[PDB]
Design a protein around this ligand. Structure first.
Ligand code: PA5
Ligand code: PA5
Lengths: 555, 555
């Protein structure tokens, strides 16, 4: 693997072996008063500031330096330029990677196979703009002359999670917009529980599918259609309640949706990167089109930052580099994303797919197997809730778990003269502080004594109340969570993923494990039909199938 | 640490060192046709069967044997009996651990400090039964003579997640019940967005708090109260819309809720184990009291199974033991819980708190530090969604990730003559199959050729389409997800956690990291007030506070 062969990587690894023991946050902070100044970055977007404070990390000036040196040596700069220029850097599918073109508000020409993709990106935006206005204003009428009150996205994965995370996070901006629902799972529960609350006369279904062949989506889609036709009984009415977000025109047509109702996208738009395309129609419908444009601008701003900023102060790069430090040196398997914002309750889950699906790889550009770790397991829940649950382990377990703590300075709901937000912020600041400094035997002993504990009550209890601390975290604090800022934060991590991907020399933009999952279920499916016992697999798959069948009958 | 000193543990570890290389699922399956029979367990509860198939694990008869031997040597049996007898096994708080008494339908006497806790457990159930009937039937009227249509749980953590997970999962059983909302986070968004959709005339608030001092809950609670009094303007009306689930009577009274409106619980009920107590009132109100009783019976059944079944075929024990194998031998940091059921969309998250908060420890009963791993990082999302996102990493990453795949044989919504559920099941069966057998170079080469790929297209692509497989999983398939079965599945994992806890010699039932988080925010809080720069912390906490303040002003 390229990484391990890297001189800078080896230099980085030997230092780790030599100094890990000298990396103590308490000591690093008291020995350098400019530690926050030197290990923090500030982005003024003109639509809010973002503070990327990575000072509570197990790093010194020499590591960062080495980390940066490793970024150059691995060719992060040129690889980045390849993506922005539309070269086919998704070498296994032979595709370009241009989610950055979807939000290219500047409209500088971006070529794919010699042809500027921009005129078509904008043609689809206009189209989404025009449709959104009509639907939101009431001009667009359902089959009985009623306005749309409900918009239902049917799609799974990249055609689901993004639009879901964003509408959820931008909820406050949905005044005057129809309600949005996300049906993704093939589990009948998802479609049925949603349909039960809908009136066909005012519901609009959106079939979000790049290939338009994904089993789950097309099955949900057919069920939605049949439920709709049972009411409308007129196939011409479908053009009034069904639209498609796909790249496959023939498929859309064959399904029964009229080409005019197709909002198209391109093969260079990876699903886990598709919210900026037509796939984000649900968002535009919910919060309005201007807000959609604001979302893409924020990402556009972040793109410009990723693209022209020197590595030493490049937000996505530094975050990627700290992750490498913890992954390839400290050995941490996971990476937590803890947004202290109830509107971002799906943020971590969105990047669980974005990160893990992007960088959960073991094959390099040269086809050789990595002999190092790659993408981490990303998870998290919003603060403060997590403080009452899994933080126990982050504080007192046997795993190191790098954490990203995120939060808006301004809340959408400054109720009680800002009481709730102050408490939220205070909890936000103190966990990274505490995770950092912990609480020693003596500190715990002192307080126990003060509490009037007896020499023997104190002695048994004490060690259990001891915190070792030294647990690294990032604090990302932004002005306010508006459509613009949201777009920038998401695009920040997208690029974090990309830097780490290059450094590992893997393909961040294919997903053969997902591609395979989309073919795996074919044998089993028809074998579940009938009552015969199955015997054509391993004993486990056969044993499970036979239990399923035995249990089909029980009442 | 006790674990490492254990002869059976050492015997287990030496074998691992000697044979890990001989552990290949494909080979283990073709070399032993009774592999599913021997490495699977079946529980007939009389209200459904549960198949715990652990055959796709990296284990042989000799390991399990050793694993079981390790359970005996570590005294799992007697420690279990201690818990069921009500001894104070939460040695650091000096508390008993009797979540099993909350669902002790048998009513055999269970003593805490010599006194049977049962008469009081039942007194509170009756009380919840009586209240639920009144509220659900319409007999209980709001301050203007209207019936309750909305029940709002205010509580965080153990006083939140359980009731949330269960009502969500038992949604189909809520016919004739009021809607339920869960406000947990201090984030003003949570309370405000909920209150905006409520009419005070027909909303009932439940303040779920063991201590009744938790900052977030009491603040939400006060905000709820003020919003209610602004409408009702009569303090006597509070007795008609506010109830408490607490152990602290004085506090409840001091808050303004009338003692008759208190549903009490006890110190031996750990929050992450409290859904079976009064804390589950929301559930009983939503799905009805009989269903609540059904939930507790299922757990009661699982308790009996945990308690009287020989270790070799004890569900919780075996699951705990497989986890130890992967944690203390293979070194896996995480453990995934993948319910293929949209109703269980919070199941994994519930056990993220139950597991991690329980076993994220490093101090043993003797006060010495563990020199081995303990609780893992638990995460997951429902299937099939995950197959399109993070499975990419489980399939092709550089981490081993033990997975629990769960699913009902019978869905609550057999729409389309069972089409969706068959597809769901087929996807459920094939991922564990595929995770297991993977796809070799030759298999990928063969298919690529068949696809007419050119010698050079094939050659570059191939290695990327190669799956190494050998990724272990458990399949837990049950008859149908009813209140009863749900109760049994939850209680199964509760006991899994407990076995692993004993084996590690840690206290699964305290949570000083959470206890500490509940005190940490006091300095910061008043320092956020005002405009002065803060300088009384480390440079990071000061730098963040000062950015927060600078950004308070921006528009
Ligand atoms: O990220 C991916 O590639 C997958 O999650 C796909 O987005 C998902 O399978 C949806 O596929 P499609 O949009 O082609 O229906
Ligand atoms: O698990 C825990 O102990 C915590 O999550 C508590 O349940 C949480 O802090 C709620 O505390 P209380 O119920 O005392 O308000």
């Amino acid at each position: 693997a390229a990484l391990t062969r890297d001189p800078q990587f080896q230099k980085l690894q030997q230092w780790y072996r030599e100094h890990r023991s000298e990396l103590n946050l308490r000591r690093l902070f008291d020995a350098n008063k400019d530690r926050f100044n030197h290990f923090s970055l500030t982005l003024n977007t003109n639509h809010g500031h973002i503070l990327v404070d990575y000072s509570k990390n197990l790093v010194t000036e020499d590591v960062m330096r080495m980390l940066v040196d490793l970024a150059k040596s691995r060719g992060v700069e040129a690889a980045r330029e390849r993506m922005f220029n539309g070269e086919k850097i998704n070498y296994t599918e032979g595709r370009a990677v241009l989610h950055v073109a979807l939000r290219n508000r500047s409209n500088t020409p971006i070529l794919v196979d010699g042809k500027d993709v921009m005129p078509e990106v904008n043609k689809v935006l206009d189209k989404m703009k025009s449709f959104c206005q009509r639907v939101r204003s009431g001009d667009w009428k359902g089959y009985t002359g009623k306005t749309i009150t409900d918009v239902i996205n049917i799609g799974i994965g990249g055609s689901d999670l993004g639009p879901l995370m964003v509408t959820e996070a931008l909820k406050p901006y949905s005044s005057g917009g129809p309600r949005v629902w996300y049906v993704s799972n093939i589990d009948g529960t998802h479609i049925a529980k949603t349909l039960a609350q809908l009136n066909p006369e005012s519901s609009l279904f959106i079939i979000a599918s790049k290939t338009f062949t994904t089993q789950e989506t097309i099955t949900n889609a057919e069920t939605a259609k049949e439920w709709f036709l049972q009411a409308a009984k007129d196939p011409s009415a479908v053009a009034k309640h069904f639209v498609a977000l796909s790249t496959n025109t023939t498929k859309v047509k064959e399904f029964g949706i009229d080409p005019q109702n197709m909002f198209e996208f391109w093969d260079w738009v990876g699903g886990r990167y598709s919210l900026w395309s037509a796939i984000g129609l649900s968002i535009a419908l919910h919060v309005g089109f201007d807000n959609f444009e604001q979302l893409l601008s924020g990402a556009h701003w972040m793109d410009q930052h990723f693209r022209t900023t020197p590595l030493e102060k490049n937000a996505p790069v530094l975050l990627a580099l700290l992750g490498i430090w913890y992954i390839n040196c400290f050995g941490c398997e996971t990476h937590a994303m803890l947004p202290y914002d109830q509107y971002l309750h799906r943020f971590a889950a969105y990047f669980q797919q974005g990160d893990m699906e992007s960088n959960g790889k073991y094959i390099t550009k040269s086809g050789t197997r990595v002999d190092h770790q790659t993408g981490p397991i990303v998870w998290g829940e919003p603060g403060t809730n997590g403080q009452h649950a899994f933080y126990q382990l982050i504080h007192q377990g046997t795993k190191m778990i790098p954490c990203d703590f995120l939060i808006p300075v301004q809340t959408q709901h400054p109720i009680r003269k800002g009481l709730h937000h102050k408490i939220l912020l205070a909890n936000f600041l103190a966990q990274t502080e505490a995770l950092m400094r912990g609480k020693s035997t003596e500190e715990a002993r002192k307080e126990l004594q003060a509490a009037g504990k007896s020499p023997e009550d104190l002695e048994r209890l004490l060690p259990h109340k001891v915190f070792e601390g030294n647990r690294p975290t990032n604090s990302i604090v932004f002005t306010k969570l508006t459509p613009f800022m949201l777009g920038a934060l998401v695009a920040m991590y997208e690029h974090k993923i990309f830097v780490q991907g290059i450094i590992w020399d893997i393909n961040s933009f294919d997903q053969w494990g997902v591609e395979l999952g989309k073919q795996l279920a074919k044998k089993i499916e028809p074998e579940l039909d009938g009552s015969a016992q199955v015997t054509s697999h391993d004993a486990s798959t056969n044993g499970l199938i036979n239990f399923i069948k035995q249990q089909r009958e029980a009442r």
